[PDB]
Design a protein around this nucleic acid. Structure first.
Lengths: 848, 153, 61, 869, 63
RNA sequence: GGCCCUUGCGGUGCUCCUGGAGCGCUCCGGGUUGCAGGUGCCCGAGGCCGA
């Protein structure tokens, strides 16, 4: 029944770490908090890898072959993964914090810099052992923490920068002339250090903004092995110089712009450097020629990387989580995205199910395309945060309500805010609701305790509905009846009739305060979440309570770091705050301040399933029992870590702010699922949480769901029937199983001209199954008009019979419709653009 | 009295290396440039600048009598300076690890804290600097050294 | 004032549906109207017992 | 090659100690002690300060027989070959050349001494691996049973025999220094006393002789009446105390100064003592044994009474039942014959925990301890069921013991026994026993079966009887298994008579009954899928759907009794473990065998991880849990249907790292020639050709980049991801050339020219579908006569388009590229007559193709809209 | 936003805004205008002048 | 239900592996370490009070 798998994490493109391009250079690997996303610029795609971690990713090491990758979190745990199979190979635990990880270009060794040391390991082999990496050697040079790594293209020596403003260079294996060498000449921390294309000459960049060039007298092939000695000699019996050529300044005197990130392409001799002020510079190193410079953002530039070809440069800004890919030769952006952390609070689906509109505390409205995964239009008309958002039932119109006191409607045809509604009295709106017809727009207030209703076409205030006591928690229109249900904090849910001459109103009294209201898709049942964590299902027309669900125990909630009370005491005072019916309505999804979303069976009033949103342990309140290891005699001492986290700067933490830049507890926010929504199609659902926008989609692999099995029903008999040309029976047996590949083969085996016989012989029950499979088929199948003929025949045969039961087939038809719509539109754009144009040419030749 | 008499801008960036001369009462300040600055509350500019290292300085300590200064830096050199008008380095030694911290007793002994190991150099001290030829005592700590000081008596 | 600070740390006071544990929390003139004892708290049990208005059905539920 | 296809062994869980004695190892660079204990095919290292795990070694193919440590390295011996471990994890040196098992290892500086069973003694140089010296001793005359190198002796080793003689030897000179007549009992232990020239000798009779080897006098003799002296250690913290081990597990403390017994330690270990050692200059004693225990003892109490200071313990008896607990999958619940319940973590041993023994009247145990309260101890657990929901509020585990009427309850967070003993009120005698237990999904109710055939339901929170199934009893015979559906709608039970009955859970009304060919053995239900698995006494497995109550699959091929069964989380694989020492995987959608690998020992229990990464097994006589990695997750595997009557030839060791029937199908490129097909080329490549200019213009920044005036004119260039021009240049050639040398025709234009002669444009088609939209626009713009492309070549591109319409493949690319071409050269087009004849053919084809498709599209949408209204 | 493909193609400006249309949607020259058409235009112009005077006079009072 | 030197009864003293937060140790190897520009931070008591 409820077989859904996580598919993508929209809404966030960069949190922290270093950026890396894939080996071919088409895709970019970006850390998004807990996870890793690959953006394929070649095909306009974004996919999040299924892997999850305990803490945020600090380092990403990418193998030269492209098959392997190493992902390390802040806690020190490391994960060896294959990019080809998108699956985790093996696990490891580095003892201390690792600043960076770099693979040798040959592909045999990699260096891990941690604490004051750098350890060089072999690359993982084909042999499988419980311990993944065999440590090879250790180097213990610098005074203080090591920062960066670089390797010579001959893989003979490597270089490590340090925090103690000295740069150390080591040899891959013991050279007689070069065991190690040290470099000074700087007065601040080293940010990066590189090597020439085919020499050991190096560059050192300091945080102050100084670049130093070091040149040695010995060619890299001049390195000679140490003479064997010790016990090898017993078996057998039976220095370089560096000089500072040049020193360059990236800034004018009197300006303090700290260098923060650097990247260097050897073959083109190209340097790209990003500074604390948000500007980056390009240079050609041996002459230090400034090509051009840009300003990206007010925030600093955290990480910078350049692809193999050298055309694309990647920039990340952790201040707003902004990711940018820049092509310097074309002077244009390839990709540019921005998403603030913890911003999103709202969610909606288009009626087709193709787009998702969200609003955040920042005040921005964003529309995302679920297939591509990228935002394509953003509206900034609102000044303060957006509390609610909704699509109209028919048009491509999005309506938002904000703390500005305004409810604005935007069109997607012309991309303009054509209508704005405001109250006569200055009040702040908390939610929005729009009728299915789209004529009526409604909103509720934080303080004025009254619902405002406006007309869409005219734009005047139709009415103010009063009677509630306390703020309005939520509103919802009945999809089929055009009545408005609003819940308030006076333990009441009120029903308002709009197209009624006598203004009939209903009240539904509750034991405790109400928080949310939702209608089933048909509109005959209503759900209210109350403060005692109960979900009550009512019949709106008769005002009778059909059922109730107790859900306090299921919402497993964990203690925050600063909470004096325990988990149970806090849980006794928290309830569900987000509800959403399934497409069919047989199940209900509930969520709140926890990492769990609970799916209940409404009729049985039992919990079918519990979904874990995240396992990131760098987010507050995830785990019920805090670790005893961190306790000391004076307490857990959370304020030390609080100051360390707020050392990010950018703003100044302010007392009493729960959320935002000025909030002190911003580095580790609490885990909260702000909202849930289900696709009208019924093939996926989404949730807005602190981590981002989460998409869960149907995947057949998760669960096996046969319909009517028999000992006779088997793929052997299916193919036997196929060889015997009894197509109908093979189709029926392939449909009794719910395997997509077998029914795919069974349908594709049929030659044309026998379609109508098969369609006529099909019984009524299998019609819905065939339509579902055809709808799934149009997305990923090459054979367009074959399935067009199939769909045409079944529809023209069974439309009249499907009309009577059209009520229960809504999630299917919607699905099918949009798929059949999609391809059609592009063809209608292109083919006609040929036809008439060609005819026009054929006209001109005649007049000559 | 409870009043701030002076607040001086060293004009050298971050300040992390500091010691005083009990005989002289002046303050020594180390910089990443390799210079040690002599300061007094009356002057708005340093009394003198002394170039001691080819890289950044990380420690400074002077004896009770005020005759000698001991400094260590990034070039892994331990130096003994003559503070009686000449300011020449009397003793020099290259070290495997780095001397993070330094101190003097009241009899003239010098201890350098390197990593998790302490080493004490002793000399006759009768109008002579400590002899850095070979250390007097050694001891290995459980963790890296973060502070050194001798008991007065 | 030491008793008042004690209560918010022990989670006996809520501002609307949200329960707040931070003593540093400035309350608006509108929002001061909706500060009250959180349900199923021992203090609200004592208040309701004093007023002879304690019923086990509603509070415990 | 590999016995299995889908599975491979990864690690063992819950094992800490075995019979191989431990060694204590001081370390350089870290002033601490480390003790290394053998665990099956690997070894574990713990710091003695807090008994924390620091390293886990790599696996070896055979079980380790002997172990040695010399500070720098750890030496392990398996079979006739022994290896050296570096960093406590990974092998760096292996030493072959012995034809018998190694029974003693003695590290000697940079050289290692190995003594074989047959009687060969060989010294190996470690690093070079060469053979230094070899000696043999007659098995009948002198069989080596103890080896010792006395301290402060240059190149000297002392050898003892089972016969009773001792020989002192010099390795370097290779000569016999002296022969000790010894005692007729025979030597079983050798130890260096805290003196320059004194040794302690253990004997098989229980007598320990402390001797001076230089002048051959016996200082003292001590006798224990407990059998042979396994090991001896000396206290070096300033007190003359000696400890000697015994196979009974007892330890005797002898006073060296006054030649007397101080005190005796009784039952330090339940099994035989493996090795005991006093820590250097410490009042601490380290003991391990075969009972999977490692213990530390401190002698600081009055009268020097040792007390238990630290320990690391696992199950000391063979396992009975194991099961994953929780949906996260990091912990496993296991019960053993010792009568205790324990939880083992799958990520790290620090999260391991024990739930304690079965104990009636717990408050009595507080007063008198575990010992002296043996009467209240409960019989061992045979079956249990646990549920994670409601674990915080009340109990979540139900367990039935061996031969006991009542069922016990357990609490996870409290980590102790529950507060209820569930039984029918009427019965009191123990002639009837409980056989099957199950707990519902919500966790409120527990269903208990009886051997009499009665089935009862109890509430977990209160323990109150809530009714029973059937008018008097559910089944005539014993109830073998019970199960509850996930939605609490159907309850299904089995009987020994062979009947399968389905009940309603709420009102307890019988629904349907199914007869079985053979008596059912074990029973499990996969709740979410609704798939029920039955194992019968005739060795077959029957699979049926709970909803329709009818059989769906039959599996046969096991050659022994089936012990336990397991499902994959997706529900596609059924794994069953049998007495024939084979584990078989069945594919439910196909109903055919997929995997069958043999085992050395018969597997008792099997369980699949909730996440699906690992498979857990337990064996008949082993004390630990073994994990098997599913390789389908981290690698692609092609399932192959094996024959049903298959016997696996190859055996796989547990703890070491090292047709018509199937369902897979690939779609052809074209179903029929007349059928119109589309490529799955990405959307961004072809859909944005007509709007390319405006799309690129918006991408450019609002404020142009700042360019310095001093910047030079020439900057380095990157040619591009794909070469639009075939040949860049014709090692040290010139760079100044006249005209006629550099390439003047695009590779696309060259392919088009060749297409005219042979009427083949596939080569040009491949370039056209590989270049991106920016490249495509440039190529078509270059095709114009103004840009250097002949009107003959443009005739070739028009003929390219027509061909793609006759094949009716790549239909969207045909419309996309033709639309761009029309946009670019519409003005030049009607003037040139040659291009017209192509259009008239092209115009007809696009008209007939679109009109047929446009009708089919339009009839579909109008019907769907009519269904909506 | 910046992207390599465009989802919606439109003028960004309404057809009425590009070229304004009268209420009737047709234009008649002075020659074609009949008796009633000229009467209506006279009536509307007097109608506008009347109401504007009221609005100006009301605004004058408020000042 | 089982308990038989017992208890619907109560208390103590030690042990129970820091995510980042006891790093660095098979072998090899460590020797000839071979003055750009800085002006910060802190300084408000009046009650729509309760007792």
């Amino acid at each position: 029944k409820f077989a859904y798998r996580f598919s993508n994490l929209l809404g966030t493109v960069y949190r922290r770490g270093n950026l890396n391009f894939t080996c071919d250079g088409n895709s970019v690997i970006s850390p998004v908090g807990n996870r890793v996303t690959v953006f394929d610029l070649k095909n306009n795609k974004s996919d999040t890898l299924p892997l999850a971690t305990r803490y945020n990713v600090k380092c990403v090491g990418l193998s030269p072959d492209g098959r392997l990758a190493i992902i390390v979190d802040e806690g020190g745990d490391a994960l060896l993964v294959s990019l080809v199979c998108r699956s985790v190979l093996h696990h490891f635990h580095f003892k201390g914090s690792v600043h960076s990880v770099s693979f040798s270009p040959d592909g045999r060794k990699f260096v891990v810099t941690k604490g004051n040391i750098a350890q060089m390991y072999h690359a993982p082999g084909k042999k499988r052992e419980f311990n993944a990496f065999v440590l090879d050697k250790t180097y213990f040079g610098p005074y203080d923490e090591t920062t960066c790594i670089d390797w010579t293209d001959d893989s003979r020596c490597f270089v490590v920068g340090s925090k103690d403003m000295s740069t150390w260079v080591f040899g891959a294996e013991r050279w007689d002339n070069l065991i190690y060498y040290a470099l000074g000449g700087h007065k601040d921390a080293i940010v990066a250090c590189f090597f020439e294309s085919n020499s050991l000459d190096l560059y050192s960049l300091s945080q102050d903004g100084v670049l130093c060039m070091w040149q040695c007298d010995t060619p890299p092939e001049g390195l000679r092995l140490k003479p064997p000695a010790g016990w090898k000699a017993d078996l057998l019996q039976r220095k370089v110089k560096y000089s500072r050529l040049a020193k360059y300044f990236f800034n004018k005197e009197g300006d303090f712009n700290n260098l923060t990130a650097a990247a260097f392409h050897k073959k083109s001799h190209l340097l790209v450097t990003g500074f604390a002020s948000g500007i980056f510079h390009l240079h050609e190193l041996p002459e230090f020629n400034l090509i051009h410079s840009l300003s990206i953002s007010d925030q600093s530039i955290a990480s910078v990387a350049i692809n193999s070809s050298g055309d694309w440069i990647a920039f990340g800004c952790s201040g707003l989580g902004q990711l940018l890919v820049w092509e310097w030769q074309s002077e244009s952006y390839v990709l540019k995205q921005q998403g603030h952390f913890n911003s999103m609070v709202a969610l909606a689906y288009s009626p087709d199910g193709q787009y998702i509109v969200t609003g955040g505390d920042d005040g921005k409205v964003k529309v995302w395309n679920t297939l591509s995964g990228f935002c394509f239009v953003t509206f900034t008309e609102h000044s303060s945060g957006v509390t609610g958002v909704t699509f109209t039932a028919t048009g491509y119109v999005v309506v938002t309500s904000s703390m500005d006191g305004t409810v604005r409607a935007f069109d997607l045809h012309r991309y303009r805010n054509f209508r704005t509604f405001t109250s006569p009295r200055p009040t702040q709106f908390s939610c929005v609701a729009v009728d299915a017809s789209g004529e009526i727009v409604s909103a509720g207030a934080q303080d004025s305790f009254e619902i405002f209703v406006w007309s869409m076409q005219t734009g005047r205030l139709l009415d103010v509905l009063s009677g509630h006591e306390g703020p309005i928690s939520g509103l919802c229109f009945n999809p089929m009846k055009s009545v408005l249900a609003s819940a308030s904090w006076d333990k009441t849910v009120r029903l308002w009739d709009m197209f009624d001459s006598w203004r009939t109103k209903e009240t539904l009294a509750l034991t405790s305060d109400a928080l949310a209201v939702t209608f089933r898709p048909d509109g005959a049942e209503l759900a209210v979440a109350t403060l005692n964590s109960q979900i009550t299902f009512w019949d709106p027309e008769n005002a009778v309570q059909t059922g109730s669900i107790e859900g306090r125990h299921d919402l497993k909630t964990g203690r925050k770091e600063l909470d004096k009370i325990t988990a149970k005491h806090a849980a006794k005072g928290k309830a569900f705050t987000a509800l959403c019916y399934s497409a069919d309505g047989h199940s209900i999804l509930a969520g709140g301040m926890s990492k769990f979303v609970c799916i209940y069976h409404v009729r049985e009033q039992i919990l079918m399933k519990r979904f874990e949103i995240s396992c990131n342990l760098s987010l507050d309140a995830m785990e019920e029992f805090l670790n005893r290891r961190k306790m000391t005699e004076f307490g857990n001492l959370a304020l030390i870590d609080q100051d360390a986290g707020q050392e990010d700067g950018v703003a100044i933490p302010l007392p009493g702010v729960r959320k935002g830049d000025m909030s002190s507890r911003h580095f580790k926010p609490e885990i909260r699922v702000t909202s849930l929504r289900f696709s009208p199609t019924g093939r996926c659902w989404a949730a807005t949480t602190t981590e981002g926008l989460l998409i869960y989609s149907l995947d057949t692999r998760v669960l096996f769901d046969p319909f009517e099995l028999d000992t006779s029903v088997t793929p052997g008999r299916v193919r036997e029937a196929l060889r015997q040309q009894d197509f109908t029976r093979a189709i029926l047996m392939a449909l009794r199983l719910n395997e997509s590949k077998l029914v795919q083969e069974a349908l594709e085996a049929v030659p044309r001209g026998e379609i109508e016989v098969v369609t006529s012989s099909l019984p009524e029950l299998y019609v819905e199954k065939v339509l579902e499979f055809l709808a799934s088929s149009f997305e990923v199948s090459r054979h367009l008009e074959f399935y067009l003929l199939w769909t045409h025949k079944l529809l023209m045969l069974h439309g009249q019979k499907l009309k009577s039961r059209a009520g229960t087939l809504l999630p299917v038809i919607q699905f099918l419709q949009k798929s059949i719509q999609r391809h059609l539109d592009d063809l209608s754009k292109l083919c006609s653009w040929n036809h008439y144009n060609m005819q026009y040419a054929l006209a001109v030749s005649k007049q000559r | 009295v409870g009043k701030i008499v002076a607040a001086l801008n060293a004009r050298a960036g971050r300040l992390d290396v500091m010691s005083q001369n009990p005989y002289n009462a002046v303050i020594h300040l180390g910089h990443s440039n390799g210079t040690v600055s002599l300061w007094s509350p009356a002057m708005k500019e340093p009394l003198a600048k002394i170039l001691c290292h080819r890289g950044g300085v990380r420690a400074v300590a002077v004896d009770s009598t005020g005759t000698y200064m001991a400094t260590s830096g990034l070039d892994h050199q331990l130096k003994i300076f003559d503070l009686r008008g000449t300011y020449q380095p009397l003793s020099t030694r290259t070290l495997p690890h780095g001397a993070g911290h330094l101190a003097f007793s009241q009899r003239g002994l010098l201890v350098a804290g390197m990593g998790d190991v302490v080493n004490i150099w002793a000399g006759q001290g009768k109008a002579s600097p400590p002899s850095l030829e070979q250390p007097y005592l050694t001891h290995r700590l459980s963790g890296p050294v973060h502070g050194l000081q001798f008991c007065p008596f | 004032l030491q008793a008042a600070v004690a209560f918010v740390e022990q989670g006996h006071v809520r501002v609307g549906p949200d329960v707040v544990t931070d003593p540093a929390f400035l309350v608006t003139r509108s929002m001061e109207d909706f500060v009250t004892w959180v349900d199923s708290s021992k203090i609200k049990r004592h208040v309701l017992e004093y007023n002879e208005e304690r019923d086990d059905f509603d509070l415990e539920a | 090659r590999t016995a299995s296809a889908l599975f491979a062994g990864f690690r063992a869980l819950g094992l800490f100690s075995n019979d191989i004695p431990h060694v204590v190892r001081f370390s350089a660079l870290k002033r601490r002690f480390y003790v290394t204990t053998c665990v099956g095919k690997s070894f574990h290292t713990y710091d003695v300060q807090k008994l924390s795990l620091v390293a886990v070694s790599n696996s070896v193919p055979q079980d380790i027989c002997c172990m040695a440590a010399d500070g720098r390295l750890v030496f392990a011996a398996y079979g006739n070959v022994f290896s050296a471990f570096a960093r406590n994890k990974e092998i760096v040196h292996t030493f072959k050349g012995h034809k018998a098992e190694i029974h003693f290892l003695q590290p000697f500086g940079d050289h290692i001494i190995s003594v074989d069973t047959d009687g060969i003694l060989i010294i190996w140089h470690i690093y070079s691996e060469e053979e230094y010296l070899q000696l043999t001793f007659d098995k009948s005359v002198f069989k080596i049973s103890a080896i010792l190198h006395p301290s402060t002796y240059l190149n000297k080793i002392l050898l003892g025999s089972e016969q009773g003689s001792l020989q002192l030897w010099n390795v370097k000179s290779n000569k016999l220094l002296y022969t000790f007549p010894g005692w007729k009992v025979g030597v079983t232990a050798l130890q260096q006393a805290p003196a320059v020239d004194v040794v302690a000798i253990g004997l098989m009779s229980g007598q320990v002789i402390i001797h001076n080897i230089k002048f051959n006098e016996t200082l003292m003799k001590f006798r224990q009446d407990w059998g042979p002296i396994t090991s001896i250690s000396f206290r070096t913290d300033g007190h003359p105390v000696m400890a000697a081990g015994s196979p009974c597990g007892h330890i005797g403390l002898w006073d060296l100064e006054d030649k007397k017994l101080i005190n005796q330690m009784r039952n330090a270990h339940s099994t035989a003592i493996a090795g005991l050692t006093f820590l250097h200059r410490e009042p601490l004693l380290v003991t391990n044994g075969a009972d999977n225990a490692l213990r530390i003892w401190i002698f600081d109490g009055p009268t020097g009474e040792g007390r238990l200071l630290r320990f690391r313990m696992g199950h000391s008896a063979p396992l009975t039942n194991i099961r994953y607990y929780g949906q996260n999958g990091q912990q496993i619940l296991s019960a053993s014959q010792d009568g205790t319940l324990q939880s083992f973590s799958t990520v790290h041993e620090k999260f391991n925990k024990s739930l304690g023994h079965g104990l009636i009247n717990k408050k009595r145990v507080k007063r008198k301890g575990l010992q002296n309260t043996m009467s209240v101890r409960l019989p061992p657990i045979t079956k249990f069921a646990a549920e994670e929901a409601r674990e915080s509020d009340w109990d979540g585990i139900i367990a039935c013991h061996q031969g006991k009427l009542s069922c016990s309850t357990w609490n996870y967070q409290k980590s102790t026994i529950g507060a209820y003993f569930l039984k029918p009120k009427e019965l009191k005698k123990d002639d009837i026993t409980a056989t099957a237990v199950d707990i519902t999904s919500c966790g409120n109710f527990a269903v208990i079966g009886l051997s009499s055939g009665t089935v009862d339901v109890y509430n977990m929170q209160s323990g109150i009887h809530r009714g029973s199934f059937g008018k008097d009893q559910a089944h005539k015979g014993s109830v073998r298994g019970v199960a509850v559906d996930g939605l609490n709608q159907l309850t299904v039970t089995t009987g020994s008579e062979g009947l399968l009955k389905f009940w309603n859970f709420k009102n307890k009304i019988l629904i349907h009954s199914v007869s079985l060919s053979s008596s059912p053995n074990i029973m499990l239900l996969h709740r979410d899928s609704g798939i029920l698995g039955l194992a019968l006494d005739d060795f077959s497995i029957s699979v049926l759907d709970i909803e329709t109550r009818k059989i769906v699959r039959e599996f046969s091929g096991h050659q022994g009794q089936i012990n336990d069964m397991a499902f994959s989380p997706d529900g596609r694989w059924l794994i069953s473990a049998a007495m024939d020492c084979s584990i078989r995987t069945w594919d439910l959608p196909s109903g055919c065998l997929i995997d069958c690998f043999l085992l050395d020992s018969a597997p008792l229990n099997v369980s699949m991880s909730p996440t699906g990464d690992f498979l857990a097994t337990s064996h008949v006589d082993h004390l630990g849990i073994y994990l098997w990695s599913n390789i389908s997750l981290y690698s692609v595997v092609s399932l192959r249907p094996l024959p049903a009557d298959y016997v696996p030839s190859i055996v796989m060791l547990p703890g070491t790292c090292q047709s018509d029937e199937l369902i897979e199908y690939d779609s052809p490129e074209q179903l029929n020639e007349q059928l119109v097909t589309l490529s799955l080329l990405p959307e961004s490549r072809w859909k944005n050709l007509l709007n390319l200019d405006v799309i690129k213009k918006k991408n450019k920044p609002k404020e142009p980049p700042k360019v310095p005036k001093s910047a030079p004119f020439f900057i380095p260039t990157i040619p591009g991801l794909v070469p639009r021009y075939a040949a860049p240049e014709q090692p040290q050639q010139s760079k100044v050339v006249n005209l006629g040398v550099l390439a003047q025709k695009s590779d696309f234009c060259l392919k088009l020219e060749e297409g005219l002669v042979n009427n083949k444009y596939d080569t040009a088609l491949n370039l056209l579908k590989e270049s991106g939209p920016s490249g495509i626009e440039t190529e078509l713009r270059s095709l114009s006569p103004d840009c250097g492309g002949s009107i003959e070549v443009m005739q070739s591109f028009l003929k390219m388009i027509g061909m793609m319409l006759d094949r009716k493949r790549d239909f969207e690319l045909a419309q996309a590229y033709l639309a761009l071409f029309l946009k670019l050269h519409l003005k030049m087009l009607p003037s040139e007559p040659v291009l017209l004849e192509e259009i008239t053919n092209l115009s007809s084809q696009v008209e007939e193709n679109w009109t047929h498709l446009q009708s089919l599209f339009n009839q579909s949408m109008c019907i769907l809209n009519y269904l909506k209204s | 936003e910046v992207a390599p493909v465009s989802v919606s193609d439109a003028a960004l400006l309404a057809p009425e805004e590009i070229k304004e249309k009268n209420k009737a949607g047709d234009i008649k020259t002075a020659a074609e205008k009949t008796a009633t058409d000229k009467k209506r235009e006279r009536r509307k112009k007097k109608y506008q002048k009347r109401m504007k005077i009221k609005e100006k006079e009301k605004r004058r009072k408020l000042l």
